[PDB]
């Protein structure tokens, strides 16, 4: 899978 | 601009409606309008701004990656010449992406960052500055690639310095900053060891502070810690 | 328009690229440009045109439904007054949706339908005309609601008449036309019994002709027959 | 679920 960057909201 | 005649509060209201309708271009335009009213943003408003542009640029980045892959395969040996169209259309998407990045960076420079005095706001905006320079770096190929990379690095580094001084290791903004800076190191700066080191240290220092948190804050922090772990698993 | 300087073949090429990148607004603009070259469309090109605008209007319709639901709840008893913003933004999305529908109907009237002599092309375009009038009907509330509904009905009916005369009962265009006309009856014309009757008859007549088909054509036809069955299950 | 309209391509 593709690496994760931030998806936080809150 | 076009939102100059609409009340600040109405722009925020409509941004929330646009989010519910998954109309992220509209959401971004409403939030740009709100920023241009000149008042500082609340925590909720900062998050609306980020969500809007993240979704817009996210779609553009995904499209660019598709088109770049097609272009790269077109320039292999044995590939039949199909003319300028693939390059042209990739360039079109790229220019629009660069335009959105420049818009966000413009809002940050005029004048969100300079008015942001609290750690939470300042780190948030500097992280954003790093992110949008990082997206510019993803598509950069010319003379200014090194300067774009350095601009991203510098924003992230200032954000990290403030966050380490002023925020707990479990703060979601601090965690998301470190996550994105680690991705910068891995993907942009050709520094996979730095990426891994940062992700590990961040995770471990958050783990040790979880005991201080409420149930709700614990959930927030562990969510982002899992993203760090996911990357570590992919990278090692 | 803006695509006036681009070769027809390049517009088609870029429409296919836009599809792969899920850039449906771009895809639609490229296909509009291709239509405006004035030549008839091939089967593949007709499908590119349909896919592009279906996706564009699909997003707008979904957004409109979200906003309309919020608006409807705002006008209940006991609901707190929140000002004009919900109505305004619903109206904004609605106007943009109507604009896209008018664009498609304009292309059909100038001059796709009048040049379409083969059953396959003529039925395809008349089905499209019915569909985009149907989408206009979904949001219509004023004087012209009845005329919009009648325009949809008339296009669908002409398409049905040609398709019954000139196409086999398993033809995917004929099947998709009957599916959409049945939805028109159920949702727009307040005629659920007509909707059910049409869906049943269409399904049964296709079933009886499946034996004539190759494996690949069988797969195509049964796919759409399943959609008819799904609706019948929901409606009965 | 929501009723189906045509999604044939082709
Ligand atoms: Ca003003
Ligand atoms: Ca005001
Ligand atoms: Ca470029
Ligand atoms: Ca301040
Ligand atoms: Ca603090
Ligand atoms: Ca021309
Ligand atoms: Ca030409
Ligand atoms: Ca209206
Ligand atoms: Ca003809
Ligand atoms: Ca025939
Ligand atoms: Cl282009
Ligand atoms: Cl509006």
Residue numbers in the entry:
A (entry chain B), D (entry chain B): 114 to 123
B (entry chain A), C (entry chain A): -4 to 231
Task: Please quote the authors directly.
Among the numerous protein families facilitating PPIs, the family of 14-3-3 proteins stands out due to their ubiquity and high conservation across isoforms. These ‘central hub’ proteins hold a key role in cellular signaling networks, as they are known to interact with over 1200 protein clients, and are involved in pathways related to metabolism, apoptosis, cell signaling and tumor development. Protein interaction with 14-3-3 can yield a multitude of effects,8e.g., the structural stabilization of the client protein, the masking of functional sequences, or bringing two proteins together. In this work, we developed and validated a deep learning approach for predicting putative protein–protein interaction sites between 14-3-3 proteins and phosphorylated client proteins.
Our model was applied to identify novel putative binding sites on biologically relevant 14-3-3 client proteins (FOXO3, Myc, BAD, Notch-4, CFTR and p53). The model was used to screen 296 potential binding sites and to select eight peptide sequences for follow-up assays. Experimental validation confirmed the predictive power of our model, with three out of eight newly predicted phosphopeptides exhibiting low-micromolar binding affinities to 14-3-3, two weak binders and two binders with marginal affinity. Structural characterization via X-ray crystallography further substantiated our findings, revealing binding modes consistent with known 14-3-3-client interactions. This includes an ‘open’ binding mode, where peptides bend out of the 14-3-3 pocket, an ‘extended’ binding mode, in which peptides occupy the entire 14-3-3 pocket, and peptides featuring a disordered C-terminus. The identification of such structurally representative 14-3-3 binding motifs, without having provided such structural information to our models, testifies to the strength of our deep learning approach.
